[PDB]
């Protein structure tokens, strides 16, 4: 109407099952694309941001409590490497990549915000917020959204997640917005 | 021949044969390989029409056909008849 009306969700009970969907170019040029691993978003959304990180035996204190729950160390590296029906994500600092034991038996991990010692640091807001989704053969898009109690707090994806549109080199025009799920669907410009 | 309405008449034009890649593409450019005189005719057609009593045809270029159905509408407000198929057309302007 005169803007993209989130409070036009006025279909069951507790609503955090709304979404943002779209489409773009198919194998544009020759590679593909990649979303911002947990887009920081102008709202922390107060979500239980499950960070199943890849810390050391030293980051068991504050790698958890920077807007998350559980974090392990060397006890989930080599001990949880032999499990195919049981056993967000930070990254081991400097350069110690996770495909030496944690790619054994496509997931979801870019990195965590820098500090060189802590995670819940002397300035920590962008660390518990919105989601991300990479390629998808046909289309792509497909992200999460927001909570049931939010007037203006839901319209946070106009120049943020719908401006994740910064990894589509060339093909056509990388936008075909269509938001809302588990009830209905509205579609809007960004 | 000529349009009785418009005055249009066959005009003389050239027929130019060319060859070559247009400069605006691959280039070198085109080369006229023969020009020659020829004419373009107006698209003349036939319009039989009732009007007053008598039948009256026009020789007229297709572009101008409607212009006749204008006259027939302008012709209603007139005193006419008197065995005059051709003498109508004349008076039909």
């Amino acid at each position: 109407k005169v803007y993209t009306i989130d409070e036009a969700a006025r279909t069951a009970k507790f609503d955090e099952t709304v979404e943002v969907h779209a489409k773009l170019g198919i194998d544009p040029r020759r590679s593909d694309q990649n979303v911002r691993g947990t887009v920081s978003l102008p709202h922390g959304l107060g979500k239980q941001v499950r960070v199943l990180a890849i810390a050391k035996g030293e980051k068991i204190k504050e790698a958890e409590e920077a807007g998350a729950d559980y974090v392990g160390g060397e006890e989930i590296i080599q001990a949880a490497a032999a499990a195919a029906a049981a056993a967000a994500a930070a990254a081991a600092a400097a350069a110690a990549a996770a495909a030496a034991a944690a790619a054994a038996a496509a997931a979801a991990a870019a990195a965590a915000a820098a500090a060189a010692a802590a995670a819940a640091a002397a300035a920590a807001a962008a660390a518990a917020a919105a989601a991300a989704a990479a390629a998808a053969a046909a289309a792509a898009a497909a992200a999460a959204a927001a909570a049931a109690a939010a007037a203006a707090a839901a319209a946070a994806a106009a120049a943020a997640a719908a401006a994740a549109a910064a990894a589509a080199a060339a093909a056509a025009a990388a936008a075909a917005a269509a938001a809302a799920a588990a009830a209905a669907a509205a579609a809007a410009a960004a | 021949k000529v349009c009785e309405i418009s005055g249009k008449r066959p005009i003389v034009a050239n027929s130019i044969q060319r060859r070559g890649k247009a400069k605006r593409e691959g280039g070198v450019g085109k080369k006229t390989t023969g020009i020659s005189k020829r004419r373009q005719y107006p698209n003349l057609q036939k319009v039989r029409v009732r009007v007053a009593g008598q039948e009256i045809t026009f020789r007229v270029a297709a572009s101008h056909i409607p212009k006749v159905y204008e006259l027939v509408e302008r012709a209603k407000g007139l005193r006419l008849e008197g065995l005059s198929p051709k003498e109508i057309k004349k008076e039909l302007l």
């Binding site: - | 159905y69 204008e70 509408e73």
Partner: protein, 145 residues
């Protein structure tokens, strides 16, 4: 091709309808068969003039009926017929009714636009309806002497 109809037709009909067609059709069919005419503004405005006239010229005979309704819709007639008992000796057709009502109130009436079946032939109370379109039921009273 813009044209205004006359003789209604299939796919395009009731007179005076402006509708668009193939110039070949108009030109080699409708116009020469007088089944429609060019939708020239010359004619188009003359069409407006057929409507604007008749149309409103007909809210006369409609608003004039209600101007005559608001005199007899309430007013009474009263006929001093020469009758015997409850039954009457002669009848009372409208040529009487209409006439009596002229010489009783100075108003003209058609013996035709009534709502009459039989000629009464019977003393009592009756109130018939009039015509056309919206209708005006006049009130009448039957008597003796």
């Amino acid at each position: 091709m813009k044209v205004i109809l006359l003789e209604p037709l299939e796919n395009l009909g009731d007179v005076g309808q402006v509708v668009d067609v193939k110039p070949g059709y108009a030109r080699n069919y409708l116009l020469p068969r007088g089944l429609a005419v060019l939708a020239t503004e010359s004619n188009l405005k003359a069409l407006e003039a057929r409507i604007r006239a008749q149309a409103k010229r007909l809210a006369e005979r409609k608003a004039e009926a209600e101007r005559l309704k608001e005199i007899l819709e309430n007013l009474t007639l009263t006929i001093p017929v020469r009758a015997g008992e409850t039954k009457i000796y002669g009848s009372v057709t409208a040529k009487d009714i209409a006439e009596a009502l002229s010489r009783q109130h100075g108003v003209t009436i058609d013996p035709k636009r009534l709502a009459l079946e039989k000629p009464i032939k019977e003393l009592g109370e009756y109130v018939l309806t009039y015509k056309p379109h919206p209708e005006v039921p006049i009130q009448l009273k039957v008597s003796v002497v």
